[PDB]
Amino acid sequence: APLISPIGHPMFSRIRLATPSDVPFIHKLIHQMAVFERLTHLFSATESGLASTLFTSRPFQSFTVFLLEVSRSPFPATSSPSPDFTPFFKTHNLDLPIDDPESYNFSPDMLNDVVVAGFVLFFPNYSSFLSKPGFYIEDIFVREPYRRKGFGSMLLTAVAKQAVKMGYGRVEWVVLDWNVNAIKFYEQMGAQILQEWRVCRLTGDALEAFDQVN
Amino acid sequence: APLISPIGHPMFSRIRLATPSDVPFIHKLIHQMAVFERLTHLFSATESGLASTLFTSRPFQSFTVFLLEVSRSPFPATSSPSPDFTPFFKTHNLDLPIDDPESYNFSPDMLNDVVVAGFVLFFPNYSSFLSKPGFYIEDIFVREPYRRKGFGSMLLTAVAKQAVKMGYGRVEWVVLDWNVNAIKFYEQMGAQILQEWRVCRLTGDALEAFDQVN
């Protein structure tokens, strides 16, 4: 195909490990996710809480976050937070340029046009039958100006590739039963929906009541 | 109530942290769980695999197992594996004595009549909206001679009490949608079933295929 001209409106992406410096961006992404999911009454996250709880172990040992950053220019390629990870890169052909007015709140530096567009939070789970760890994806969120461009699936693929690299047995996550388009995409990549399983949660006053029963 | 005589057929229980010495008992409990759940083709766990993967972090930092032991005599009350845990004890009034022919395979010592009857495997999960860890229960299993006596709920309550002690935000687990009796018991204790959620799993050849896509 004789294509000389570069793509119109290219967008460069990088998926990297979050470090403590990224706490304000993680906090703001979670707040936007609460607004998006209509679960704002549950939002009580703080920067101090995220800083205090997300980095008590090494990357991939417990809570791990990958951040997705985007730029209108290639990323110029500090030691990585883990010896077991190197960032992923991809070039995207956008149909139209992206309008992102909140980019000032999601810019680690800003002088290089690097904007945090989304995240995935995950941690090791376990398969008793295989005697092997796996990864469980707790949350994937992409900010509204970047949705419907394949970025959420790239964050999922980053976790799946990390599991294979580490010799892990499974990658698990939840899908909303009415999100028919996501279900079909997951079935297309070979994932199985565990039809019989229902998730139970004990929290708030109901969880607090266990302090008394002996 | 003028009750002088001790209960007929008392059974004493203790819930404690599993240590590396318990690996053969964990392996045998998982094998019985595979037979019980009719998922024996998936069973490939080994003692070396469990030893290699379950103790790479401190208790409660990642994969944690509580074991349930039972005895026809009280437990006589070695330093605990964690500074954050002390074993739980309970006295049970059994209607009839228990027949457990496999007790020789589940006896850490045997000279004190201490038999491993079940386990719970769990690990920290996370609530982004609270910026707080929680616990996710991966598996609870009670061996057949000890079922229908409240031991499974005691293992669940052990995890819930550990979450409260640590200041954690949630305790989560899965129930089979047709296990109507368990669902009603969970609703009675204040747990909520997350009706919309479906669990997806990527494993085997489908997971291995992510090694190639770049």
UniProtKB/Swiss-Prot annotation, chains A, B:
GO CC terms, sorted: cytosol; nucleus
Gene3D superfamilies to which the protein is assigned, alphabetical: 3.40.630.30
Compartment(s) of residence: Cytoplasm; Nucleus
GO MF: N-acetyltransferase activity; protein-lysine-acetyltransferase activity; protein-N-terminal amino-acid acetyltransferase activity
Keywords: Acyltransferase, Cytoplasm, Nucleus, Transferase
Positions that bind acetyl-CoA: 140-142, 148-153, 179-181, 186
The EC number(s) this enzyme carries: 2.3.1.48
Active site per database record: 186 (proton donor)
Pfam families for this protein: Acetyltransf_1
Catalytic activity field: an N-terminal L-alpha-aminoacyl-[protein] + acetyl-CoA = N-terminal N(alpha)-acetyl-L-alpha-aminoacyl-[protein] + CoA + H(+); L-lysyl-[protein] + acetyl-CoA = N(6)-acetyl-L-lysyl-[protein] + CoA + H(+)
N-acetyltransferase domain: residues covered: 77-214
TM spans (from-to): none
Tissue expr: Expressed throughout the plant.
SUPFAM superfamilies: Acyl-CoA N-acyltransferases (Nat)
Enzyme superclass (EC): transferase
Similarity comment: family membership: Belongs to the acetyltransferase family. GNAT subfamily.
Subunit: Oligomer.
Role, per record: Probable protein acetyltransferase with dual specificity triggering both N-alpha-acetylation (NTA) and epsilon-lysine acetylation (KA).
Stored PANTHER family: DIAMINE N-ACETYLTRANSFERASE (PTHR10545), GH14572P-RELATED (PTHR10545:SF29)
The protein, known as: GCN5-related N-acetyltransferase 8
